[PDB]
Every structure is written in C-alpha cells, then in structure tokens.
Amino acid sequence: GAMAPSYRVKRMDIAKNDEECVVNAANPRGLPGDGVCKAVYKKWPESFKNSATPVGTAKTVMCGTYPVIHAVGPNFSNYTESEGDRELAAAYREVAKEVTRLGVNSVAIPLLSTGVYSGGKDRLTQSLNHLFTAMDSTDADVVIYCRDKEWEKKISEAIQMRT
Ligand SMILES: [Cl-]
Ligand SMILES: [Cl-]
Ligand SMILES: [Cl-]
C-alpha cells in the first residue's frame, strides 16, 4: 500500500503516467479504439493480446511487467441511463479488485464513459463518484488523468472537498 493513500489529478496523456499500472478506457473487443484507448494501444500494444472483456468488467494484461487494466465502461448511446449507471459502477468495482490483486502502490485512471461513450452528456460527477465508491477502500495512490482544463479544476475541487 501507499503510506498515506491519496487522490490526485493531472491534465496530460495517461500514456505518460508516473504510476505502477494504468487503467485503459477499453472497448469490449480489445480493439485499438480512439482517445485514451488509442494512446494506450500505441504505448502498450502487447497488452491487447486477449484483452476483450464484457461491459462492466476489467481484464488485466501485462506489457512486460507493467499491468494494463482494460476497464470497459458502458456506451451510454446503447444503454439506458439506469443500466449504464449500473455497468459504470461495476467497471470501477472490477478495477478496484484488479488494483488490489496486483499489489501496486499507485494506479493511473481515466474517467470511464466520459468521452465517446458519454452519449453526449457531461458525466464527470457520475463517473468520478463511481471511481471514489470503488477505490476509497483501496490503499493505492490514485492519479486521475484528464485532458480538459475545466475538468481538471472540477476533479481537483471534488478531491479537495473530501479532505
Ligand atoms: Cl501530454
Ligand atoms: Cl469514453
Ligand atoms: Cl477530460
């Protein structure tokens, strides 16, 4: 575990993270995809061997000794708000299990279902709260990666509010 487990946020490419493992915002088919998934495919392509996994699950594949946790959030274009919410919460619980099993002291994580799977809605708060629900009982340092300056501000505020 980390000596004083924390949450942090950084506005940069998760492919350049400084953590002991990465969560991919994966698709269910293990395809290179776009956004975070394409950056992860370019940086850790070896990790996409048999990475296909259902919605609401996480599947870890090593790239060397570096773990890539493929977490499949729902595409809210396809799911009802209710079912999508359930699967998004489930994906994060499976990430917490993996992070725990791997014994890492830190993990780089994107906000699942906030990009092309958002169904054109702002899901910062919905996705972040499910991340907290899952990760609060873990003792890894969590570093959340985002790309937008206003998202960085909002995530940083939500972290600081609970401290
Ligand atoms: Cl960057
Ligand atoms: Cl997404
Ligand atoms: Cl973002």
Q: Which two tokens stand for residue 86?
A: 């359930």
17 labelled binding-site residue: no
Q: Which one, of 121, 115, 126, 133, lies nearest residue 154 by Cα? A: 126
In the chain, the number of structural domains is 1
Q: State how far the Cα of 30 lies from the Cα of 20, in Å rounded to an integer.
A: 22
CA-based diameter of the chain, in Å?
Answer: 41
Q: State how far the Cα of 15 lies from the Cα of 30, in Å rounded to an integer.
A: 17
Q: Which one, of 100, 158, 103, lies nearest residue 130 by Cα? A: 158
Q: What is the number of the ligand closest to the CA of 34?
A: 2
Which experimental approach was used here? X-ray
Residue 41, classed as helix, strand or coil, is helix
For ligand 3, the distance from its centroid to the CA atom of residue 152, given in whole angstroms, is 7
- The DSSP code for 68 is E
Burial 44-65 (b: 16+ CB within 10 A, else e): beebbeebebebbbbbbbebee
For ligand 1, the distance from its centroid to the CA atom of residue 13, given in whole angstroms, is 4
Whether residue 124 contacts residue 146, with contact meaning beta carbons closer than 8 Å, is answered with no
50 labelled binding-site residue: no
For ligand 1, the distance from its centroid to the CA atom of residue 80, given in whole angstroms, is 33
64 labelled binding-site residue: no
- The DSSP code for 47 is G
Other C-beta atoms closer than 10 Å to the C-beta of 20 total 18
Q: Which domain holds residue 104?
A: 1-163
For ligand 3, the distance from its centroid to the CA atom of residue 147, given in whole angstroms, is 4
